[PDB]
């Protein structure tokens, strides 16, 4: 009545969600998940997330599905910047840092991490791209540190008027407003690729 592959490994979700350090949004981390089993309902309740939004699929119905590969993206942004991590959204983050496709099928998980990513003197280790000539294609990662040319005069790699470094630091202090505090974000992408499915839910096979 039910038949899934004989997969025994557990998916390294704890390696992603409970990592001691996350990445800057402009250089986001992508973990490729394959050949493992994952329960998405225990993940929904494993912690108290601020946003757990799914698109297309549902977390409850997600346990009944198999996928070729599942992709996990993790980074840190501001509190009121999480709304840009969604299909069809625009903004400094969606345009120049991390972009979702309009036909996005998956879930985006975010939770406050002020106690982890805020330092007293200010945590300037989390960066974000402020200047970019054009938008990002979906799932594109631009880690270039080229001096941004805002004027007609070339920059020759030196900062000045109309020549600005394209990356800026978040001022992450624990006394910030709720919208200014760091939020760790995890994006889950489900890929069906006409191939053996290797990432399934926790359903047990019969005969």
């Amino acid at each position, epitope marked *: 009545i039910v038949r899934f592959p004989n997969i025994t490994n557990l998916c390294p979700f704890g390696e992603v969600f409970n990592a001691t350090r996350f990445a800057s949004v402009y250089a986001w981390n992508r973990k490729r998940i394959s050949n493992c089993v994952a329960d998405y309902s225990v993940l929904y309740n494993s912690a108290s997330f601020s946003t757990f939004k799914c698109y297309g699929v549902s977390p409850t119905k997600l346990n009944d599905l198999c996928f070729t590969n599942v992709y996990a993206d993790s980074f840190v942004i501001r509190g*009121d910047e999480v709304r840009q991590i969604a299909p069809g959204q625009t903004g400094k983050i969606a*345009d120049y840092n991390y972009k979702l496709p309009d036909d996005f099928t998956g879930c985006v998980i975010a939770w406050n991490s002020n106690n982890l990513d805020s330092k007293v003197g200010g945590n300037y280790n989390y960066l974000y791209r402020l200047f*970019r000539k*054009s938008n990002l294609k979906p799932f594109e990662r631009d880690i270039s540190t080229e001096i941004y040319q805002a004027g*007609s005069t070339p920059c020759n790699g030196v900062e000045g008027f*109309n020549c600005y*470094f394209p990356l800026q630091s978040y*001022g992450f202090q624990p*006394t910030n*407003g709720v919208g200014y505090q760091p939020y760790r974000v995890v994006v889950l992408s489900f890929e069906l690729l006409h191939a053996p499915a290797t990432v399934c839910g926790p359903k047990k096979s019969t005969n």
Partner: antibody
Amino acid sequence: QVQLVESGGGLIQPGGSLRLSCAASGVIVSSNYMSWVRQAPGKGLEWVSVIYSGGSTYYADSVKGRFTISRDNSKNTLYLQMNSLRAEDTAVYYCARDLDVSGGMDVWGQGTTVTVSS
Amino acid sequence: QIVLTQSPGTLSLSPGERATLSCRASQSVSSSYLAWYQQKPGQAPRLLIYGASSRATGIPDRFSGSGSGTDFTLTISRLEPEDFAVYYCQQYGSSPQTFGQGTKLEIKR
């Protein structure tokens, strides 16, 4: 030079349309955050609209649906198409570039005056 | 949205004194997203300070800014005759960006 020169402002009645122009030199409009800021007579400053280098556009809630911001890279000019104008839209409109945390709004035009009355 | 309440309404001082302008926000604002602008009658706004403390290029040393959270300050250590104008603060960290109603710096006699 680094100048922003504005034009297109004038007199119109409620409902009419107007297109403001903002010609730039020393700064490329398609490579910067370009904003419109207005100031009603004897009042403070109010942000109106912005267009990103990548094309994203945002408007204030009071002018959303009636205003449209655009640019022409060949002419290096910025536009603000205003339709269905109202008496409260009477203000001096400024164009400016935004450097955000990297330097704020450092270049401003001289301003063009718009008057809406019947 | 975020409301910036500047105080006092008008500041009456003689050239040479120190001017202290207050900008109080209705919400906590990160110091990196506060700016100060100067406007004279009939002219366009002139950027003084961005990031609550960074001077724009061409702004003399007598202009200085400070503040964090909800309370911000623009200080002119020694007022010059050309410093009498209207000064606005501005937050640009929360959409939509907003300005204060302005403080008028007026020659006292």
